[PDB]
Every structure is written in C-alpha cells, then in structure tokens.
Enzyme design. Structure first.
Site, PDB file in Angstrom:
ATOM      1  N   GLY A  90       0.878  -1.093  -0.156  1.00 41.50           N
ATOM      2  CA  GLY A  90      -0.082   0.002  -0.166  1.00 41.50           C
ATOM      3  C   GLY A  90       0.723   1.407   0.104  1.00 41.50           C
ATOM      4  O   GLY A  90       0.447   2.045  -0.346  1.00 41.50           O
TER       5      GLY A  90
ATOM      6  N   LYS B  87       3.992   1.876   7.386  1.00 42.15           N
ATOM      7  CA  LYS B  87       2.995   2.204   8.391  1.00 42.15           C
ATOM      8  C   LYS B  87       3.341   1.605   9.908  1.00 42.15           C
ATOM      9  O   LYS B  87       3.190   2.103  10.724  1.00 42.15           O
ATOM     10  CB  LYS B  87       1.539   1.445   7.999  1.00 42.15           C
ATOM     11  CG  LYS B  87       0.567   1.689   9.177  1.00 42.15           C
ATOM     12  CD  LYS B  87      -0.829   0.827   8.690  1.00 42.15           C
ATOM     13  CE  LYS B  87      -2.046   1.438   9.709  1.00 42.15           C
ATOM     14  NZ  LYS B  87      -3.555   0.834   9.527  1.00 42.15           N
ATOM     15  N   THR B  88       3.973   0.451   9.731  1.00 45.66           N
ATOM     16  CA  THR B  88       4.557  -0.060  10.983  1.00 45.66           C
ATOM     17  C   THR B  88       5.730   0.134  11.359  1.00 45.66           C
ATOM     18  O   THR B  88       6.436   0.082  12.374  1.00 45.66           O
ATOM     19  CB  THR B  88       4.481  -1.691  10.978  1.00 45.66           C
ATOM     20  OG1 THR B  88       5.498  -2.180   9.929  1.00 45.66           O
ATOM     21  CG2 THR B  88       3.107  -2.058  10.714  1.00 45.66           C
ATOM     22  N   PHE B  89       6.601   0.552  10.246  1.00 43.99           N
ATOM     23  CA  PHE B  89       8.218   1.090  10.166  1.00 43.99           C
ATOM     24  C   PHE B  89       8.852  -0.242  10.676  1.00 43.99           C
ATOM     25  O   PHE B  89      10.056  -0.135  11.243  1.00 43.99           O
ATOM     26  CB  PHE B  89       8.466   1.965  11.055  1.00 43.99           C
ATOM     27  CG  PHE B  89       9.280   3.177  10.458  1.00 43.99           C
ATOM     28  CD1 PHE B  89      10.563   3.056  10.906  1.00 43.99           C
ATOM     29  CD2 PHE B  89       9.202   3.550   9.277  1.00 43.99           C
ATOM     30  CE1 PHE B  89      11.794   3.885  10.347  1.00 43.99           C
ATOM     31  CE2 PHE B  89      10.002   4.644   8.592  1.00 43.99           C
ATOM     32  CZ  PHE B  89      11.392   4.693   9.139  1.00 43.99           C
TER      33      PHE B  89
ATOM     34  N   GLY C 189      -3.352   0.202   4.651  1.00 44.23           N
ATOM     35  CA  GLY C 189      -2.414   0.231   3.892  1.00 44.23           C
ATOM     36  C   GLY C 189      -3.015   0.233   2.511  1.00 44.23           C
ATOM     37  O   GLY C 189      -2.559   1.189   1.568  1.00 44.23           O
TER      38      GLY C 189
ATOM     39  N   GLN D 127      -4.612  -5.271  -5.343  1.00 39.14           N
ATOM     40  CA  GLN D 127      -4.300  -5.273  -3.886  1.00 39.14           C
ATOM     41  C   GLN D 127      -5.717  -4.598  -3.252  1.00 39.14           C
ATOM     42  O   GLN D 127      -6.264  -5.382  -2.516  1.00 39.14           O
ATOM     43  CB  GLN D 127      -3.236  -4.379  -3.592  1.00 39.14           C
ATOM     44  CG  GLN D 127      -3.268  -4.199  -1.966  1.00 39.14           C
ATOM     45  CD  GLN D 127      -2.180  -3.530  -1.182  1.00 39.14           C
ATOM     46  OE1 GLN D 127      -1.753  -3.834  -0.209  1.00 39.14           O
ATOM     47  NE2 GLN D 127      -1.491  -2.444  -1.896  1.00 39.14           N
TER      48      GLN D 127
ATOM     49  N   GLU E 259      -6.713  -8.136  -1.831  1.00 41.92           N
ATOM     50  CA  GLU E 259      -6.350  -8.292  -0.554  1.00 41.92           C
ATOM     51  C   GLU E 259      -7.544  -7.896   0.830  1.00 41.92           C
ATOM     52  O   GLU E 259      -7.662  -8.347   1.605  1.00 41.92           O
ATOM     53  CB  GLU E 259      -5.133  -7.184  -0.067  1.00 41.92           C
ATOM     54  CG  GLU E 259      -4.687  -7.137   1.323  1.00 41.92           C
ATOM     55  CD  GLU E 259      -3.397  -6.323   1.628  1.00 41.92           C
ATOM     56  OE1 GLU E 259      -3.406  -5.337   1.980  1.00 41.92           O
ATOM     57  OE2 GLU E 259      -2.421  -7.233   1.153  1.00 41.92           O
TER      58      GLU E 259
ATOM     59  N   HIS F 151      -4.541  -6.674 -28.392  1.00 44.70           N
ATOM     60  CA  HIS F 151      -3.352  -7.385 -29.185  1.00 44.70           C
ATOM     61  C   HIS F 151      -2.714  -8.477 -28.357  1.00 44.70           C
ATOM     62  O   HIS F 151      -1.585  -8.851 -28.848  1.00 44.70           O
ATOM     63  CB  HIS F 151      -2.589  -6.205 -30.013  1.00 44.70           C
ATOM     64  CG  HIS F 151      -3.123  -5.303 -30.799  1.00 44.70           C
ATOM     65  ND1 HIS F 151      -3.549  -4.099 -30.194  1.00 44.70           N
ATOM     66  CD2 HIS F 151      -3.498  -5.413 -32.183  1.00 44.70           C
ATOM     67  CE1 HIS F 151      -4.367  -3.523 -31.084  1.00 44.70           C
ATOM     68  NE2 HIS F 151      -4.140  -4.214 -32.478  1.00 44.70           N
TER      69      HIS F 151
END
Lengths: 554, 554
Positions: free
Chosen positions: A158, A210-212, A271, A353, A357, A388
């Site tokens: 994310g 986000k969590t690092f 995320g 995603q 997800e 194509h």
C-alpha cells in the site's frame, strides 16, 4: 450460512436457475428500446461527468430490483453509516475504518473513542503543504547546499502501489515537480538500478512504512542510508535527506529520522486505502499539493454520493451488485479492468491489492466458513494493447469474464487534430459492441461467400470464424482524467469493494492471510547461511534450499 | 468430443472422482520421503541449470503416468515432429509454425514446400549483425552527422511485448547500447510523452509490423514521421532514421522506407512467437548482437530437449500436463506466474499474450465445439511485491490458483554481501511451503495461547487465523538469469502451450478472435466525426457515442 441463508438470496437462485436462457443481450436489446437509458447512471460532479453504463449486462429490471433487495436486507445502508461514524467495523483487529476522514474536506467531526480525528488529519496535511512548497521552490536544500531534483519513495504494497499509480496517472500535472522513483521489491536490483543514477546531493528519500518494521522496506531504507552516508559522511546530513511516513514514532526515531521529519497517519488507515494520507506525500510533491487536494476532493465527492444516494441509483452499489451476480450466480472467477488510457496502465494492478487483499477472505463475522465464493481475481492491461494480447480469449475462450471498460472523452495530448484519441474511442466502443453481438455461422458464412471463397474451401474454416457473443461488460466514461475525477474513480471502487464484503459478511479490512508466509520466511533466513544442507523441512523445501547452496557457488 | 472421448481421459475422470480426498499435500509428503526426488527435473544446459520442482502438486505417480498416457495417446510426439519438419500445423490459415527455425543454430535444413528456410533466416540475421555493429559503434550517423543515442520501437502486441520484456529483463547487458523506447498504444499519450524528450538528430525509429497495416502502428509511425520531418525537412533524411520489420515489402515501400532498411521475416513466424526473428532488432541493438545470439541459443537448447527427451522427463510436457490436470479436472480458471525477480516484471504479461492468444480457442480440428475448458487466464506480478498485494487471496480466498514461482540463485546485484537476495530467496521458499502446509485451528490456537491471550478473547479471532493450505505450486529455480537461460525459459513455456493445444485439439497458432472488434471499429470511426447523434447501433453504443460528442465540446 449468512449469504446462502438469505431469503432474497435464495429467491435469486431460483429465478436464476429458471431464467438463465432468457438472459441473451442481443435479444434484451430488441425488447427494451431504451435499455440504455434504464441501465446507465449520469453523475455530475460539477468538475466533469462520469457515465456508468451497465446496460450490456446479463441483467433485467427484475434482477436489479432483487439485487437491490439483497443489499438492503443484508444491512448495506447501516454498515455504511457505521463506517462514516467511526465505528469499529474492522472487527478482527477491532479498528475503525476511516480512509473517508482523510479527504473529509468539510471537516465534519468524526469521532474515534469520543475524540474527533479531524484536527489530526488537517495538521499532517498542513505539514504536508508546507514541506511540498519548500521542496518544490528550491528553498529546501540538501547537504551540499543544492535543491532536490529527485524524490525516492521506499515502501511496499500500500505504501507503493497508490503513489505510483497516481503519479503515473497524473503525469501531465507534474512539470514543475522533481522526478519520482519508487523502490519496492527487496530484490537488490530495484535499489541498485535506482541509486546508480542518483546524486546524493540532490536526492530525497521517503521511508513509507505504516509499522516501520516491514522487512523489505527497512532493509531498502538502510541500504539507501548506507549509499548516502558514503558521500555525506555527516550523520546529521540525514535530516535533510530522509523523511518518514509511519504510525510508529518510536521506530522512526530508532532509525535515525528527525521526529520533525515524520508525517504521521493512523491505525484506522488501511495500507491499501492509504494514498489519501501522509502516504501520498510523493504524489503532492510531484504534482503539487494543490492537485493532491483536488484528488482528495474528488474522493470526497464520491463519498458524499455513496452515503446519501438511494441504492437503486448508487454507483458503487450498482457495481458491487453486478459483480455479485457474476460471482455467486454465474460462477466467474475473475473480473478484468480495462482502462483505455496509457497513463492509467497501473490502475488494474492497484485494484489487485485493493480488491483481492480486501475480499480474498473465507471467514464470516460469526467465525463461520463461507459456503459460497468471495472476491474475484482482478487483472488487466490498458487498451488497446490488451486487444493485441489477450482479447482472443475473452471473445472466443471457454470462460465468462465480466469486464470494466474505462476511458476519458478528452485526452491530455490531442495530437494530430485528435486523430489518436478518435481511433482509441472507436476501439473502446466496438470491443463491447462485439463482445455483446457476436457473429453467427450465417453472418460469417455470408462474409466468406462475399470474399469470393467457395463452400468447399470454407467449410472447414467457417466455425473458427463464429463469435457467440453474449459477453457482459460495463462502460465507464468520464469527461477528462484530472486529479478530481481520478479521485472520484478510486473512491468509487473502494466503496464497491466495501459493499461486497458486507453482502458476503466478511472483513474487508484485515489481512490475516499475509502472516504465515512471513513466519516461515523468518525461519528460512538463517538456514540459508552455510554450505551445509538443510533437513528441517518437507523434502521439497529442503531440496530447493540445497540446490540453492550448490548453485550459489557455481 | 475428442478430449472427452479419450479412453485415457475418461480413466482420469473416474480416478479423480474417486481419489480426490486422497490428494492432500501434507500427507503426500509423509508417505513418500523422497517425493521431492521423484517429482523434480534437473536440466543442465552447460550454461547453467534449471530445476523444475513439481513435487508440491496434487498429484501422484499414478496420476503422472495416466497424464503421460493421455499425451501419447493424443499424438503429442508426432504433432511435435510435424512442427519441426515444417508441416502446416496451423490448419485454419494453412501455415507452417516455425519459430523453431529462427534459433536453429545448427542450420539443419527445414523445408517449407520443398524449400529450405534456413538460408533466409541466417541472411536477415547477418543483416542484423552488421546493422547492430554500425549503430552501436557510432559509424551509423543521423542526418546532422550525429550518432544514435535513442532507439524507438513502434509496434503493438507481438511486435511489442517480446522486445520490451526481454530488454527489461536483460538490462545489465545493455551498458554499451543506446536507450530503448517502446511506443505501442494508439493513445496519443504514448507517442507524445516519448517524443517530447527525444532529439530527432540522434533518434532511430523501428516500425515493427508483420503485415505493415496494423492501424495503431502505422498511425504512430506516421506521427513520428511527421515529428521528424519538421526538423529534418529533407525526405531522404528518413532513410537514416527509420527501419522496418515486416513481411510486406510493398507496404514498407509505400510508407517510404528504403528497401535496404527492411529486415524481413515470414508468415510462418507468429506474432506472439516472433521475438526470435527480425522483430528482436531492438533487443540486439540494446544488448549487443552477441547476447541476442545467446538468447537464441538457449532457446535452441530447450528446443532440442523438447524434441528428443521422452515425455515422462520432458520439462514442457510436464508443465503442460500439470496445467491440464488443474484446468480440466479441478476446474481452475487461472494460472499465476510469479517470478521473484524485478527485471522479470513484464514476464507474466508477456505470457498473457503467449498463452491466452494461443489457447483461448473453442473450435476443434474437426470444426466441432469444445465441451471442456481450454486456456487459463494468466496473470501475476513479481515477488515479493505480489505478497504485499494479492497473496491474501491465494492463501485464504475461495479459489484454487496453481502458481509458478521462478527465481535466479545468483543475482546481478549482489549488494550488501548478498543480503537482499538472501531475503528474496527465503520468501520464495516459504511462500510455497506455506501454501502447502497451512495451519490448523490447533496450531493457531496454541500460538494465541502463547501470545498470552485468553480463550474468551481469542475465541472470535481464531478462525480468521487458520490456513487450510493444500495449495499447489511449481518452483522453477535456475542458476542465473542470463540471455542463454532466459532463452531457454521462454522456449520452455512456448512448448508448454504447444503441448496443451494438441491435447485439447485446437489451433494454438491462429487468432480469428481479433477480427470482429476490428471490423466494428472500422465502422465507428467515421461516425465519431460530427456533432450529430448516432442511431445506427444498439441503444448502448449509441448512448455512449452520444455522450462522447456532448462531452468532447464541454
């Protein structure tokens, strides 16, 4: 049993089992002369329009009405309010799901445990606003006193797809901005190929986690840090070159980023729903904060349409319902997203995603297993390329594939008196007309006859030339692809996925499924170290690990 | 009825219907202690190795034997010889299918209507060889006397995906080469964004069109021609700047390209099998002809393995058979290709045309309709990205998705003492171990217990934490991703798709399905011209066309 125990659901099964043959598009278009008018939705955002034409679907008014009854009966209206009011609808993690607060331009108070979240949203946004203005103007200088020419985002999932898809899509609005790079894979190639063209003096690294604590992101972030520090040699030079987008301050700090350089967001920001938060720093930086604000506003528009429009004429609800029809009744495993727009080439991937997800789940709110299908496999490439490459299977393969066709009426590059877009539009319209109408033996026969061939020649060729047709599609046609509309597009699909999880009774907002793989990767890591063989697993994993140690030396 | 009328096919149905429950991977690994050794294939090309580990499939020895019997019985061995000998196995177009002649390094005579094709293959190749050497050395100058810095390919579909996927994949071998650009979509954005950074003095345009009448390609080629001629102003300047890759000389000539600048190929070279011919001009030009020759040789290696190895131990045959198992027996609509390699990020997309355009068919050699499934929907993104996007559904969704996992043991960027690749490998091994083993209620319960939670807390969370597992995958692990091996990889999948069409009895080498859309686009084109509304179609196509005319002016 939830879904399958539903009286309106069960009523649909019987009608379906009973009228399937009645569902022929060609014929459905003879019957209703303004089928188009009854199965289309014209939305006017006042910054352009979005036509949602759902007339080429195996559907009738009766079906649509029964589909709407299912949505009501399964609590879509209320689930919806719970989301906007800040309730903890992410029931397994016990979290609120508020990507809608991020773009809440009206600043209506949205409370989470009594506390209004909006003053925190607006704060990080102003931080964003000032930081973008400093970096874009050249006021923000690097360690050797130079301006930033290159922005490099480091994050995966994310923290990656959103930024990239949007910057790729809003390319035209980025002339006054620095270049963006997106390093995501742990594969060292990704970082190495990027870094080898950069100058550390004019480079800015964004660590979006986000969590690092995401493994690949933190190890890419260290590698970059090492590369930078070989040139800079002064650790405090890091403060002018690295910024962090996280929830975990402590972790940011332990990595050495100046707390003043941290742009935060919240646990209630998922995320795969985060591009609207501080995670979009790279969008604003590249295209200007003003355009980012416009992207957020388009999403705010669609938010308001979703929340206050009655279901029978609600874009996201209609899209959700058509999908449930193909998934739980016709049985289709997938759903293609085919934007006829080159700037939108990462769109489909972004929704893999976004949809998969979120909705690739099998446990109910009751902790019961589903006894029906959930989220489809979403895929696609932009048209006309797709034509194509894989359309042969959509037209003449043995599977039904509902498709969304998308396009702007106005192109950002009206070259050659708009000849290019004209051909592009013509192909966009004909593909769906062709998936619909097909071509019988007789029509093909008459054509071969005309091409002057003779029945003994063409007798064997004829069947290969037949198209059965009757293949469903949606067509979504909007005025122009600007930040505003792109914002409305994305938010529309977000609520689509949302409506679906509610009808299915699952949790669209957790992802427990990611865990096992991470657990197992943690144990395999140290085992790869020596040249000594491994035996602690199944014969396959062992055999692989062992071929790896033998080959790495080769 | 062909397939379904087959005695070995019917024998498989009954066993399947009878032993399905017996197909549990976890248990299958207890039973056979060297399952790995019996269900894996070690190929040594002498320029590296390819491990094809197919042990984590819902399969037994008995099943594999019955699958091999089906291949024999359906004439795979003979079909195969017909291909190599130059017979007209493309039965609807009445063509030979000879991508294998393109990389026939041994120059064995392959005849088409008595005539050996090889002297023509080797000729265009030498033309290629000399042209690459001239352009790469700087001897080839542009109209203002400058060297070429930028090569721009114009083509769509097969004239596009191959070149791009390979140049993206062989990036490291391209330092001494000019940059490549790939313009494919008719969308004017594609050309406009490319051209706006180029200098016409140092730019070379390649028009790759087998027919030289493909609409988008020819109109992109004209647009570029116009852009160039605004600077050059001398029409003969075109001869130093444009080259053509086609079959139609007359058409090339009518576009104004110097016949001396035409690199040709043959009707027996299929679009989605053409990277090996003159269509690969942009590969050689970028990475050097020597590496192109090596790519062709790897494919020659796999060609020889395919043709002379007995089916029970034949890589392409094994891959084809495992796919038929999941498609015609388990019912799976798709097949994911998950290369854990960033350079291979366009691989999956390349096989969407390769597999789906070849095998998305429904008519038999007898002109009968199939009463069984054919080609799957192929999709995927490179790992580990995929993990952070759609794996949730693969692990815990409601559909079975066979997956191919691919990876090099040696990376081209062993940075940080090979730490990055190490994490990459560890995730590659664990994802398949995890798709296999899963995790029961008990295991998750024991974990929650350990994490110190309490049964009343975790009672509702527990089921969401369960993984059922038993999900199949292949693992293909090769020494290093060089031109040689990449050539062997691609040729392996080519023959995979081939074996499948034979078992299905379809034509893998035509594409009649593309036609209707093109017919209909031709009529819609002129209709888009005025501001006058259209009524000559179904209410949908009309409604769209009409919203378009209204919005274009907005």
């Amino acid at each position: 049993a939830a879904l399958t125990q539903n009286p309106q659901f069960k009523k649909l099964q019987t009608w379906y089992h009973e009228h399937r043959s009645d569902l022929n598009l060609r014929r459905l278009f003879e019957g209703d002369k303004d089928r188009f008018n009854h199965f289309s939705l014209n939305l006017n955002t006042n910054h352009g329009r979005i036509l949602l034409d759902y007339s080429k679907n195996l559907v009738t008014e009766a079906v649509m009405q029964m589909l709407v009854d299912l949505a009501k009966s399964r609590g879509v209206e209320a689930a919806r309010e719970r989301m906007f009011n800040g309730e903890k609808i992410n029931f397994t993690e016990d979290r609120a799901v508020l990507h809608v607060a991020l773009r809440n331009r009206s600043n209506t108070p949205i409370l989470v445990d009594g506390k209004d979240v909006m003053p925190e949203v607006n704060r990080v946004l102003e931080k964003m606003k000032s930081f973008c203005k400093r970096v874009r103007s050249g006021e923000w200088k690097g360690y050797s006193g130079k301006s930033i020419t290159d922005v490099i985002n480091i994050g995966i999932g994310g923290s990656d797809l959103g930024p990239l898809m949007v910057t790729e899509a809003l390319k035209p609005y980025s002339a006054e901005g620095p270049r963006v790079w997106f390093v995501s894979n742990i594969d060292g190639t990704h970082i190495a190929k990027t870094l080898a063209t950069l100058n550390p003096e004019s480079s800015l690294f964004i660590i979006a986690s986000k969590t690092f604590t995401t493994q690949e992101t933190i190890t890419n972030a260290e590698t970059a840090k090492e590369w930078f520090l070989q040139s800079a040699k002064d650790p405090s030079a890091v403060a002018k070159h690295f910024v962090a987008l996280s929830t975990n301050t402590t972790k940011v700090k332990e990595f050495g980023i100046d707390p003043q350089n941290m742009f935060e967001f919240w646990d209630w920001v998922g995320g795969r729903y985060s591009l609207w938060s501080a995670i979009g720093l790279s969008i604003a930086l590249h295209v200007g904060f003003d355009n980012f604000e416009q992207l957020l506003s388009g999403a705010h528009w669609m938010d308001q349409h979703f929340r206050t429009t009655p279901l029978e004429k609600n874009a996201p609800v209609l899209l959700a319902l058509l999908g449930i029809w193909y998934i739980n009744f016709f049985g289709c495993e997938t759903h293609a997203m085919l934007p006829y727009d080159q700037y939108l080439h990462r769109f489909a991937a972004y929704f893999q995603q976004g949809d998969m997800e979120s909705n690739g789940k099998y446990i109910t709110k009751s902790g019961t297993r589903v006894d029906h299908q959930t989220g489809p496999i979403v895929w696609g490439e932009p048209g006309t390329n797709g034509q194509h490459a894989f359309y042969q299977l959509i037209h003449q393969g043995t599977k039904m594939i509902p498709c969304d066709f998308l396009i702007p009426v106005q192109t950002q590059h009206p070259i050659r008196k708009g000849l290019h877009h004209k051909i592009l539009l013509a192909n966009f319209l004909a593909q769906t007309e062709a998936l619909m109408k097909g071509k019988s033996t007789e029509e093909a026969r008459k054509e071969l006859q005309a091409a002057g061939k003779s029945p003994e020649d063409f007798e064997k060729l004829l069947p290969h030339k037949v198209f059965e047709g009757n293949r469903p599609t949606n067509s979504i046609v909007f005025t122009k692809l600007t930040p505003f509309i792109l914002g409305a597009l994305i938010a529309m699909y977000e609520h689509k996925i949302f409506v679906q999880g509610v009808i299915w009774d699952i949790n669209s907002f957790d992802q427990w499924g990611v865990e096992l793989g991470k657990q197992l990767a943690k144990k395999i890591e140290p085992e790869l170290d020596g040249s000594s063989p491994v035996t602690s697993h199944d014969s396959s994993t062992n055999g692989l690990i062992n071929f790896i140690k033998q080959e790495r030396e080769a």
